[PDB]
Amino acid sequence: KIFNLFRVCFISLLLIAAVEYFKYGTRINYEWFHCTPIKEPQSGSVIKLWARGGPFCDKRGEYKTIVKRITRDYEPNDEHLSFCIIENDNVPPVHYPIHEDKGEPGYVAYVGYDTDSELVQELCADSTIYHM
């Protein structure tokens, strides 16, 4: 009777909430669906980040995955960071081909610890050096 009704209604409302939360969440953080962060380390603790994705994930996917990866991977309270983000201006916002060549990369960023901070200062040409 009543309890069966409450059980099924609660399951239905839970399923509705589950799908709506799926919608909202995946719309917010989609960058790890279409952009793949490929990292290439330099001499020391400093690495090269960029986003290697499909045609769809434009400079939003790029920038969001770079900032998320930087603030994720390198814990600051041991030693402060310093990074730079250099923009690829020769390219339009949405620029990848579906076939696996993807050509030019867009955003690309260097990040490391202050022990080899001189290396990142040299490696970033002129863009502002963000010491965090």
């Binding site: 799908v19 709506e20 919608k23 989609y30 279409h34 769809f56 579906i98």
Partner: protein, 315 residues
């Protein structure tokens, strides 16, 4: 004296929903302002009006309005059923319990279905779908908005069907021969409503809803006229079977062929997850299998109808 009130409540079960809904209406109307700044406006009127044009988004006030009209339809069911239908059937000289109750819910079916079918046809007439133009199914896909009448109809159907579903779950006393596929039908109907709403495409939903309504209308009419002294129930059933095939199965195959080919025999199926543009090899299988469930059940009902026809015209 309150015992008389309990007696009225038990004999007439619509007073409590009536009282609560008239309270809501009185409080909203006498509030002075009828703008969205209220909360009763959330519970009584459609929300998310785009600026002041004719276009509406979505959200949670949709669920709130669905609940309020869940109460309103329960009230309408009880009040209409008892007060109007029961004396009307008694005057019709047909004296039983099984037959009279079956006629009761078939005549209620006729009433709401005749309210809804023509209304939905009106809604489709004021659209780019005119007489099931299945090309518009592939017009703007991630349309996050529907016209006023289109959405109010949509949610009206959602609220009504969910209310029949919950009354079915409540398991009153005695379903009846033909219950399992019936609850399958209602469950898949609610899943179709909620899915085809929350995945942004209702243009592909409306034609099927029209088919369902205008089929059930004639079904209930012929059934209740057979239950009454027939006179011509056979011709009504003939009209019903022709309309049943022509609308249900023909239009459903039309929609299924159209979706499968038009949305599949193309190069336009890619994700691009911001614009929610996953009209692709993901959402297709889901809605496809739902529609297939409906059509499959319709074929089973068709087989039952064909059996009835053969048995009746065999004797």
């Amino acid at each position: 004296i309150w015992f008389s009130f309990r007696e009225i409540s038990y004999r007439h079960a619509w007073i409590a929903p009536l009282m609560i809904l008239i309270a809501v209406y009185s409080a909203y109307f006498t509030s002075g302002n009828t703008t969205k700044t209220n909360v009763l406006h959330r519970f009584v009127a459609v929300s998310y009006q785009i600026g002041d044009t004719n276009a509406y988004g979505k959200g949670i006030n949709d669920l709130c309005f669905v609940f309020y009209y869940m109460i309103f339809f329960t009230f309408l069911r009880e009040f209409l059923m008892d007060v109007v239908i029961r004396p009307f059937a008694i005057r019709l000289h047909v004296t039983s319990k099984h037959r009279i109750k079956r006629i009761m819910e078939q005549m209620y079916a006729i009433f709401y279905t005749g309210v809804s079918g023509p209304f939905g046809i009106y809604c489709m007439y004021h659209s780019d779908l005119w007489f099931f133009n299945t090309k518009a199914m592939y017009r703007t896909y991630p349309d996050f908005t529907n016209p006023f009448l289109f959405k109010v109809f949509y949610l009206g159907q959602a609220a009504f069907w969910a209310q029949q579903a919950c009354i079915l779950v409540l398991q009153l006393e005695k379903p009846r021969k033909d219950h399992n596929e019936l609850t399958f039908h209602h469950i898949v109907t609610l899943l179709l409503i909620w899915s085809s709403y929350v995945f942004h495409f209702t243009k592909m939903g409306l034609p099927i809803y029209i088919t369902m309504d205008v089929s059930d209308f004639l079904l209930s009419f012929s059934k209740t006229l057979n239950y009454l002294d027939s006179g011509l129930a056979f011709f009504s059933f003939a009209i019903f079977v022709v309309a049943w095939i022509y609308l249900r199965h023909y239009i459903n195959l039309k929609i299924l062929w159209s979706v499968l080919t038009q949305f599949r025999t193309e190069g336009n199926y890619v994700l691009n997850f911001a614009t929610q543009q996953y009209k692709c090899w993901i959402s297709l299988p889901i809605v496809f299998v739902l529609i297939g469930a409906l059509q499959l059940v319709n074929l089973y009902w068709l087989f039952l109808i064909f059996r009835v026809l053969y048995r009746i015209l065999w004797r």
